[PDB]
Specification:
The structure is cut from a larger assembly and holds chains A, B and C. Chain A is mainly beta. Helix content of chain A is 9%, strand content 23%. In chain A, the strands form two sheets. In chain A, strands 3-2-1-7-4 form a five-stranded mixed sheet, with no helix packed on it. Chain A starts with 13 loop residues before the first strand and ends in a 5-residue tail after the last helix. Chain B has one helix and three strands. Chain B has a three-stranded antiparallel sheet with strand order 2-1-3, with no helix packed on it. By secondary structure, chain C is α+β, with helices and mostly antiparallel strands. In chain C, the strands form four sheets. A four-stranded antiparallel sheet of chain C has the order 10-11-7-12. The longest helix of chain C has 18 residues. Chains in contact: B-C. The interface between B and C is medium-sized, with 14 and 10 residues. Chain A binds two RNA strands through strand 2.
Amino acid sequence: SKMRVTLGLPVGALINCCDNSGAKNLYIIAVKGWGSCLNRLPACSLGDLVLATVKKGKPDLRKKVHMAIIVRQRRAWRRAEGYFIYFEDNAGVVANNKGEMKGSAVTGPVGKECAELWPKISAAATAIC
Amino acid sequence: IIEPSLALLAQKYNCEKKVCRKCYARLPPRATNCRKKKCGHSNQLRPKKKPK
Amino acid sequence: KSVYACETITIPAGVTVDVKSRVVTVKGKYGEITRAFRHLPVDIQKTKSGNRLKVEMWYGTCTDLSCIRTLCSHIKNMFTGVMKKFQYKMRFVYAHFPINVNISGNGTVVEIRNFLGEKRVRIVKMLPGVKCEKATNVKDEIALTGTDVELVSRSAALIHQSTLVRRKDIRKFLDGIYVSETSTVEQ
RNA sequence: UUCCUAUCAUUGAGACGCAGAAGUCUCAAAGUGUCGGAUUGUUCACCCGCCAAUAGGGAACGUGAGCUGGGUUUAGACCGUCGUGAGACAGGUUAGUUUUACCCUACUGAUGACUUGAUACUGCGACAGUAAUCCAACUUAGUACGAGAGGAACAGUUGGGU
RNA sequence: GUAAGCAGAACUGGCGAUGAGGGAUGCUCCUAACGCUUGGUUAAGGUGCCAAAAUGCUCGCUCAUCAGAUACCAUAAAAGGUGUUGGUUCAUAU
C-alpha cells in the first residue's frame, strides 16, 4: 500500500548491497507489480520488492534470480512535509521469496518507507533516515 | 442447520428443474421443449444434477 | 377462422362491476381494482340477471381464442381480491447466519441485513397497493398482503430476487427467502 | 491510426463428475487492456521475468517523395561441390548510391465577403466528436464451507498502475 | 481436374463488327435488330414514391431482439423446432 515515490532505478541499474549474506552487488532484472507500457523500462522506487542477480559475491549466491528490497535511493523524492530527501547512494538487501530479509544485520541508513512497510528491516536498521 | 421441511421448499426453486442440452437454460420440471430462440426450441433436455 | 366462442363468468354477491368500453372497474367491500383490456379483440357485456358476465369473440383464430380464458382468469382474480385479499406467506431459510429483517410497515420497505454473512444492506420497497406484516408466533416469516395479485406477487418475487446467491453452488447453499403458500386472508 | 471477432483478461449471467478455493463448458459482450528482455536480418520460434491477461487477425501479405538497409537481388573478393573451360549453385561468406512536393485533393491549424440596414454586447444549441479503465492492501475473516488441509464475497476504508 | 471468371472438344446461336427497350449498374442474358419523321399498337418488363402506368380488384400463407422481395446473378447445407397453416393413416372426446 506504498505511496508513489520517484522511480530512481530502471531495470538495468547495478546497486550496492547492505546485508551480511556476502553479496557486494545487486543487478536489477524486474519489479513486482509492474503493469504494461510500450518501451518503458520497468523501474523501482524506495521500499519496494524487485528481482536481482548478484554480480560479485559468494559463489553459491551468484547466477540466480533472487528477490531483493530497495533501501536507499540517490534519486530525489518529495515527502509530504514539503522537502526533497535524497540519499548518497543506491542500495538494497537480499531477501526471501516471502519478503523477509535473508541476512540479519543491515549496514548504512535506510529510508522511512522501507521501515514503514517491512517490519523486520526496521528492527535491524541502525538509524532510519 | 438444513431443516428437512424447509429443504423441500428451497430445493424446489434450485434443484428440481430440467436443463437444455444445447443452451444450458434452466427449465421447469415438466417441460418438453426449451423456451429459448437460439437453441431452436430444442427438445433435447436433461435433469439438473443433484448432490448425493 | 372460428365463427363464435363465448365463456361466461359468475359474479359473487358482495361485488359490483362496471364495464364501460373495455375497461373494468371492480368495487367490493375491502377495496377496488381497475384494470384495462384494450389489447384483446373482445366484447365484454354483463347480463339482465346481473350476477353473470358473458364475454365473446367472433372470427377468433386459434392463437387469439386463447385470450378469452385469460380474461376470465384475470377478472376472477379481481373478485377474490376485493372480497378476500391475497396473502403470500414467505419463509426465511439459512444455515449459519440468522438473517435480520425490519419493516417500515405503513410505507412499506424491507431492509434485509446479514444475508449469508454480508454487510451490504438490501432495501426493497413494495408496489403502491400492498403491505408487509412480520408474522408473529411462527418463527421467521413474512406475510405479504394486498388486493391485486400481480402487484403482490411481483412484490413477493422482488424480495426473492434481492436475496439471491452468486459465485457459489446454489444446491448446497440454500440460504434465501421463498414463497410458501398463496392464499387469501378472509375465508 | 483504424477496423474485425473465431474473447486471453475485465463486466453480467447460465451448466458441472461446482463443498470451499481452483477451474473446465456456454451465452450477451470488441466498452477498456494485451507488457520488459537474451539469441536470430528474420516472419515464425525458444527461453528469462512480470502481469488482471501477456488472444488471433485485416486495412495493396497497412505503412520506403515516412525512416532504416540487417536480409534478398548487379558490378570486387573468398571457400566448398559441379564443369575440360568460360562459368554455375532455391550452398555458405564479407564489401557495396535509397532522388523530387512548390501542383490537386485529403487531413491539421489560420483569416474572410455576403443573407428583411449598420454597429455593439449577452445568448440559444441543431449537428459532429467524446473518456476513463484495471489492480492491490486493510477490515469483512482465519468467518462461511470442510473429516482435515486449506479458504472466499458484497457494503466500508486506503492506496497504486495505465 | 478437389474446383476455377481453369484447360481441351461436338451441334447450333451470339459477342467480336451492334446500337435501341428491359435485367438499378454490366461487350456475350431477355425483347428486338437501326434511312429522316407524324399518328396508332404491342414486346420483354412493370404500375406506393424516386419513375411513365393500380396505394386497382379478388383468394390463401407469413411477424423475423439480423423477415422477405423477381431467371443468367452476385452463395448457402446436413440436422433440428409443441412457431403457425394445412394434408396422410392408425387408436380411444383426447
